């Protein structure tokens, strides 16, 4: 399928134990799809501070359109030192691995896979 329909558990910035995905924009965009699909990634809403307290490259996912069953449909941006690797619309949240941390919320998303 080109869509998959995942609920994303959302972290607290101050939670996440692990804060970004790896060391190059192709390696993040790598481990964030595999943690999409293997249900193993985590979802912070960007506000005023969280980006510092998160390692580089950035994962993030946008809205790819304007919302199926309740899901949004997303697909990943990149970012390193202020260069975006791909186009799309608003933010939902910036993608880091999840290893057991409590979230606050759940969002659905139908991700561009």
Sequence with gaps: KTHVQLSLP????RDV??????????EVLSEARQHLKDGTCGLVEVEKGVLPQLEQPYVFIKRSDAAPHGHVMVELVAELEGIQYGRSGETLGVLVPHVGEI???????LLRK
């Design 10 to 13: 959302v972290l607290q910035v």
């Design 17 to 26: 134990l692990v804060r970004g995905f790896g060391d190059s924009v192709e």
């Design 103 to 109: 979230p606050v919320a759940y969002r659905k998303v």
